């Protein structure tokens, strides 16, 4: 009987606790009006989730003693609260159906302890701690009901798990043969379980100390909700269990291993027609192209055409070998704005990636095969170019990638695939990634006596695959320096209003790009076709002088990509002469910056081969 039940050696009455929690559910209307948690139990009826999250601050404000009993004795109290919630969910809404009994999930919003100060006095208390997940194990199947069958006579029985053990039948009731009941593993019933290793956050550490870690266990319906690298305030019971000295011996070490029996996660670092009509109205705004290009990278100064090219890359061409991915190269001295621009723009798009061209990159450009450490089996770890299969890949310090990386990147940029024949695996992974690059000069400074390919020492076989190449060196003008200094002073005086304006611009920019990807598919108009043919023929007519080649058809395909991207920027859905002229302008400016021989200006052969005519005529 409920009224006779009392927590063991505790004098807390279970029925009183249940009724007090029901009173909390009934009366708590005031988080700052129906009760908040009865509103949530109205929502759960249609949402269908099997849990009710509740705030321990709310419980404490309603009743100090109930909160204290929850914190002190969660192992008994939380099942009591579950029974209370499942009674209320059929007192109200009595005709409802739900596949599982509701699980209450108490939590304090902030940490009650930090993991360095956990003590044995905290054992079996409800606590919550802040941390970062280091590793997350495979889904462990944990038994909850053992199904036994008689080997002789096929009689079956079911027995509950007591405290992890099984009360094996020892004799079959329907034929009385001893030791004849056999556990049928796949007829038994299992719940989900997973181990999570949690490290304290870096700011919480003492000065120069290595991290402490704690083990978490998350069970059914709360199992796979966290990933490595994320941050969480995790609420659970601080358990202490014995560990056996040897797997074949039941002696246990005197020192108990501890872990967190997880009850609630709260991720702390992860974060419509109105949106559609706002974006549609914004697409008709005058100079929307310049508006979006200026919204790109507010911290960076004056680089208009670079931002415009990055915008056209982020919008991309029309998908349908018909590669629509626009390739962009940034080129300039170390310490300049290109690295900051890459580190900004990679998080501005879904499916994006950022990596270094050097061997210290966390995720390499090439796919490889490794032994997964937690299980020591082979796993095909694909590279960043493959993980960014429909997004931008930001390759910083592009220039100094080794020859194998150069070859596989050439393969990716030309074929939009990455072939691997490593360890018996033979497969051709898709990589429709938009390569955005940042390349330094080989020496410490840019050399105006030399063109881009000779300064950066990259092959023409890679440089000719890029749609646009831009120079990020700064002028030596005192007006430029003074304007840059005023801009940097404004960045120093950046305040909350500028931050909110920049974040509003960032949000609408992300939404605009995603919507344009989702719905816009530009297609050629007749004037677009005539303009593109005219552009290619005109830029080929320059070759009448000196008998040189001044263009090649991949330039035309690049212009098609850029025009389609510009049409997608303004949500036209049909590409026409306005887009084609902007594509021509930006493309010609990129060639003017990149393909300029110092002796004669722009010359197209610099991209086709290294060593332009003014250099090669030494021999």
């Amino acid at each position: 009987l409920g009224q006779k039940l009392v927590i063991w050696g505790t004098d807390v009455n279970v029925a009183a606790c249940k009724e007090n929690f029901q009173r909390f559910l009934q009366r708590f209307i005031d988080p700052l009006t129906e009760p908040l948690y009865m509103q949530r139990l109205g929502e759960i009826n249609v949402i269908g989730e099997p849990f009710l999250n509740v705030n321990c601050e709310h419980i404490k404000s309603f009743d100090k003693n109930l909160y204290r009993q929850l914190i002190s004795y969660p192992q008994e109290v939380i099942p009591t609260f579950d029974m209370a919630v499942n009674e209320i969910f059929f007192d109200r809404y009595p005709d409802s159906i739900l596949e599982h009994q509701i699980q209450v999930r108490p939590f304090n919003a902030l940490k009650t302890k930090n993991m360095r100060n956990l003590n044995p006095e905290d054992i079996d208390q409800l606590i919550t701690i802040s941390g970062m997940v280091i590793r997350t194990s495979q889904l462990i199947p944990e038994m909850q009901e053992a199904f036994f069958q008689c080997q002789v006579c096929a009689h079956t029985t079911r027995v509950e798990m007591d405290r992890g053990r099984i009360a094996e039948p020892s004799v079959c009731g329907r034929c009385h043969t001893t030791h004849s009941m056999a556990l049928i593993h796949n007829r038994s019933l299992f719940s989900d379980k997973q181990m999570i290793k949690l490290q304290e956050s870096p700011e919480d550490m003492p000065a120069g100390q290595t991290p402490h870690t704690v083990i978490l266990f998350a069970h059914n319906d709360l199992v796979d909700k966290v990933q490595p690298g994320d941050r969480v305030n995790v609420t659970g019971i601080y358990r202490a269990v014995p560990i056996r000295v040897n797997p074949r011996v039941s002696n246990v070490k005197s020192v108990y291993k501890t872990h967190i029996d997880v009850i609630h996660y709260r991720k702390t670092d992860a974060k419509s027609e109105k949106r559609v009509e706002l974006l549609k109205e914004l697409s008709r705004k005058p100079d929307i192209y310049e508006r979006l290009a200026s919204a790109l990278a507010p911290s960076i100064y004056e680089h208009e055409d670079i931002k415009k090219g990055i915008l056209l890359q982020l919008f991309g061409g029309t998908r349908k070998k018909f590669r629509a991915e626009i390739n962009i190269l940034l080129c300039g001295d170390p310490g300049t704005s290109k690295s900051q621009l890459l580190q900004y723009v990679y998080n501005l798009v879904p499916r994006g990636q950022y990596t270094s061209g050097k061997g210290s990159s966390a995720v390499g450009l090439t796919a490889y095969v490794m032994k997964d450490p937690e299980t020591r089996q082979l796993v095909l770890q694909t590279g960043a170019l493959v993980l960014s299969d429909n997004g931008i890949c930001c390759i910083d310090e592009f220039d100094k990638m080794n020859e194998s990386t150069r070859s596989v990147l050439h393969e990716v940029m030309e074929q939009q695939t990455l072939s691997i024949a490593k360890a018996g695996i033979i497969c051709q992974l898709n990589a429709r990634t938009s390569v955005l690059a940042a390349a330094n000069p080989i020496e410490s400074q840019w050399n105006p006596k030399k063109t881009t390919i000779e300064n950066i020492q990259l092959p023409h076989t890679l440089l000719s695959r890029f749609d646009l190449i831009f120079l990020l060196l700064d002028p030596q003008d005192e007006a430029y320096d003074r304007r840059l200094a005023h801009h940097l002073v404004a960045l120093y005086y950046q305040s909350e209003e500028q931050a909110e304006e920049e974040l509003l611009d960032m949000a609408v920019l992300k939404d605009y790009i995603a919507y344009a990807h989702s719905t816009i598919m530009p297609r050629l108009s007749e004037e677009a076709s005539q303009a593109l043919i005219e552009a290619y023929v005109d830029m080929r007519k320059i070759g009448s002088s000196r008998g040189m080649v001044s263009a090649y058809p991949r330039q035309l395909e690049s212009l098609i990509r850029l025009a389609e991207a510009h049409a997608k920027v303004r949500l036209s859905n049909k590409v026409e002469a306005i887009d084609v002229e902007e594509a021509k302008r930006l493309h010609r400016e990129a060639l003017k910056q990149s393909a300029t021989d110092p002796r004669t200006g722009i010359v197209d052969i610099s991209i086709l081969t290294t060593g332009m005519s003014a250099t090669s005529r030494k021999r």
């Binding site: 495979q138 889904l139 199947p141 944990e142 992890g164 053990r165 099984i166 009360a167 094996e168 593993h185 796949n186 038994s188 299992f190 719940s191 989900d192 199992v223 990933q227 797997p247 074949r248 039941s250 349908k320 018909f322 879904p350 299980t375 089996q377 082979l378 796993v379 095909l380 694909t382 993980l387 194998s404 150069r406 070859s407 596989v408 050439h410 393969e411 030309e414 691997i420 490593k422 360890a423 018996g424 695996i425 033979i426 497969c427 076989t461 050629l524 076709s529 593109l532 043919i533 290619y536 023929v537 080929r540 080649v549 090649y552 058809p553 035309l556 098609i560 086709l608 081969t609 090669s616």
Partner: protein, 442 residues
């Protein structure tokens, strides 16, 4: 319904389920005892159809009702029943992998007819059931003793004082790809396909029709289109009376400026044909166009990583940037082109590997522009032994013609706008049908 690998929770145990995944490793095929036939050692009765589960289980009572024996049994391997057995490691396919997360791996088990149909790297749909598999090392039995971080269950007689853990395994009853000889051709060819290949064989000027259909994006270069088409059809390989081969595959090289359509030819060929490979002259791996020798830390022992020509064995290898090989590949290319083999002899491996491959090379002349005053030998850096390997050399030079430039631009633009004589599937079927013929010489 197809489930993701992430959705294989314990609630899915025992249910029919379909998943998609990429195979990573395939283990050897073994015989698995499905049901033992046992002999009772102290009354000589045979017991048939003893089902097994996971630990090898002999029967626990004698079939002879009055017999007291419960341990002394002997397996009859000859009258027992076995099934073919393989386990394969898969992982999440590329489409299913969540962002910024390690790929999740799963052990699939294949039985009977499915025991080698899936190989590593293949993207395959598996149908079957998620099962739970015990830690069989922990279980002692009358048949065999035990063989000895999480807690696990307790309390079973067979388990003793140990604790039993569990792991999830997908018992696949079927496997298929996620997206898909003379006897085989004769069986596969349906009546429409027979009529189509017959009409193509009787098609007058099938030469130009196939050239146009296979290379519609290419402007001009009819001779090069014809040569590459003949490369696809190929010659008859032969074996001398002394067991020495005569090459049947031809090899074609296309030299041209970087501004011309030499890469377009290779891309069209590799898009069209099955089993073909595209590669640069420079290697994107330790192995290049030919094999290389690498240690693996699983044994700290040398093995051979295969190159592009071996992957293109019995096929076509398109090699762009042919002029810029490494010395190892450039030397081994001599054997591969003519002898159609690669003979590696290094520490821990001796192997004559097969490269029965037709090569479509694309080359850049020195100084970019093809100089007509210079000979082709002076234009390219390929050595005379290499140049003798090729059956055909073709030259693509970027003329400054206004009409040609307008035609190229028009072809690109109107083809790009069009996308929304023969289809490539028809050409594939006719080519596979035609390659079974072995013309004699009159």
């Amino acid at each position: 319904t197809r489930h993701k690998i992430r959705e294989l929770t314990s609630s899915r145990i025992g249910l029919l389920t379909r998943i998609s995944g990429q195979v990573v490793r395939t283990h050897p095929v073994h015989p698995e005892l499905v049901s033992g036939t046992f002999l009772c050692l102290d009354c000589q009765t045979v017991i048939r159809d003893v089902e097994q589960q996971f630990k090898y289980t002999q029967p626990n009572i004698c079939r002879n009702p009055v017999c007291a024996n419960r341990r002394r049994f002997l397996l009859d391997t000859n009258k027992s029943r076995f099934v073919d057995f393989q386990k394969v490691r898969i992982q999440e396919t590329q489409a299913e992998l969540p962002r910024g997360s390690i790929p999740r791996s799963l052990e699939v088990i294949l039985r009977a007819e499915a025991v080698e149909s899936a190989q590593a790297g293949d993207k395959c749909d598996f149908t079957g059931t998620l099962i739970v598999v015990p830690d069989v090392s922990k279980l002692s039995t009358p048949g065999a003793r035990a063989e000895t971080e999480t807690e696990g269950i307790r309390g079973l007689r067979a388990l003793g004082v140990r604790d039993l853990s569990y792991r999830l395994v997908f018992l696949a009853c079927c496997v298929a790809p996620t997206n898909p000889t003379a006897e085989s051709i004769k069986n596969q060819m349906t009546v429409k396909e027979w009529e189509k290949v017959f009409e193509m064989s009787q098609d007058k000027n099938l030469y130009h029709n196939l050239c146009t259909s296979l290379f519609p994006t290419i402007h001009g270069n009819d001779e090069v289109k014809r040569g590459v088409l003949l490369m696809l059809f190929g010659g008859v390989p032969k074996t001398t009376g002394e067991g020495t081969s005569l090459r049947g595959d031809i090899n074609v090289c296309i030299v041209g400026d970087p501004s011309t359509a030499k890469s377009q030819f290779l891309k069209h060929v590799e898009e069209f044909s099955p089993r073909a490979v595209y590669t640069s002259g420079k290697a994107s791996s330790a192995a290049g166009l030919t094999a290389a020798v690498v240690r693996d830390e699983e044994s700290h022992e040398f093995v051979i990583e295969a190159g592009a020509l071996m992957l293109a064995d019995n096929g076509v290898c398109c090699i762009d940037e042919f002029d810029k090989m490494d010395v190892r590949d450039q030397v081994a290319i001599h054997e591969a082109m003519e002898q159609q083999t690669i003979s590696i002899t290094k520490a821990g491996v001796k192997a004559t590997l097969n490269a029965r491959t037709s090569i479509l090379a694309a080359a850049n002349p020195i100084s970019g522009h093809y100089d007509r005053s210079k000979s082709l030998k002076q234009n390219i850096n390929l050595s005379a032994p290499i140049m003798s390997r090729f059956d055909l050399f073709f030259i693509l030079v970027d003329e400054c013609n206004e009409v040609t430039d307008y035609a190229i631009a028009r072809r690109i633009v109107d083809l790009h706008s069009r996308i929304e004589v023969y289809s490539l599937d028809d050409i594939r079927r006719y080519l596979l049908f035609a390659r079974q013929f072995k013309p004699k010489i009159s």
